[PDB]
């Protein structure tokens, strides 16, 4: 049965603090210690997915969880149905004018497009993906999956999500189709549990 969430593995293999990424608007390298001590929600995103419509809900999550020490980070990725064809210089424009359109702007940082699976995957995602069980028994249909090789712990689709705790260690990982409101309420439950 499809679970909404998995808890990440009980040990540690390091933290997110040895990694970084370039901002989509500026190419500026950001090492993730710029978020040292914050709870971080890593989301791989795309612009021509049904789940692209969840961008505004992500804003709501960010806005309502910002007073509680939560930062959302977005990673565009073209590996799932080729649903992020735009260049880095095109992605925010498309979000604003095409889909979601209507003037939509993320209220959280997006980084440069890159891979999250395969032999050129960004290293932070090697760490995240292998710190947690995969989100689903179902790997999917490989005609839609544009990377090599394929592994149990691969990200399954656009808008998969990881929560990383204030020590830089992953805590939980959501199925891409889990409603954003349930991600938000799961995060608050975690926050209230760990005081």
From Swiss-Prot:
Annotated Gene Ontology cellular component terms: extracellular region
Keyword list, A-Z: Oxidoreductase, Peroxidase, Secreted, Signal
Single GO MF descriptor: glutathione peroxidase activity
Location in the cell: Secreted
InterPro entries linked: Glutathione_peroxidase (IPR000889), GPX_AS (IPR029759), GPX_CS (IPR029760), Thioredoxin-like_sf (IPR036249)
Oxidoreductase keyword on record: yes
GO biological process: response to oxidative stress
Major place of residence: secreted
Enzyme class: oxidoreductase
Reaction equations catalysed: 2 glutathione + H2O2 = glutathione disulfide + 2 H2O
The protein's Enzyme Commission number: 1.11.1.9
Active site positions, chain numbering: 49
Entry's family note: Belongs to the glutathione peroxidase family.
PANTHER family cross-referenced by the UniProt entry: GLUTATHIONE PEROXIDASE (PTHR11592), GLUTATHIONE PEROXIDASE 6 (PTHR11592:SF15)
Protein name: Glutathione peroxidase 6
Organism per entry: Mus musculus (Mouse)
């Amino acid at each position: 049965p499809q679970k909404s969430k998995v808890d990440c593995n009980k040990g540690v293999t390091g933290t997110v603090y040895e990694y970084g990424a370039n901002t989509i608007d500026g190419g500026e390298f950001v090492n993730f210690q710029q978020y040292a001590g914050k709870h971080i929600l890593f989301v791989n995103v795309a612009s021509f997915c049904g789940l692209t419509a969840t961008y505004p809900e992500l804003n709501t999550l960010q806005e309502e969880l910002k007073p509680f020490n939560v930062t959302v980070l977005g990673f565009p990725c073209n590996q799932f149905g080729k649903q992020e064809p735009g260049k880095n210089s095109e992605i925010l424009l498309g979000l604003k004018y095409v889909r979601p359109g209507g003037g939509y702007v993320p209220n959280f940082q997006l980084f440069e497009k890159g891979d999250v699976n395969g032999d050129n995957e960004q290293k932070v995602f090697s760490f995240l993906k292998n710190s947690c069980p995969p989100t689903s028994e179902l790997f999917g249909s490989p005609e839609h999956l544009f990377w090599d090789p394929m592994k149990v712990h691969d990200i399954r689709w656009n808008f998969e999500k990881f929560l990383v705790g204030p020590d830089g260690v992953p805590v939980m990982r959501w199925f891409h189709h889990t409603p954003v409101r349930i991600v938000q309420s799961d995060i608050m439950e975690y926050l209230n549990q760990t005081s």
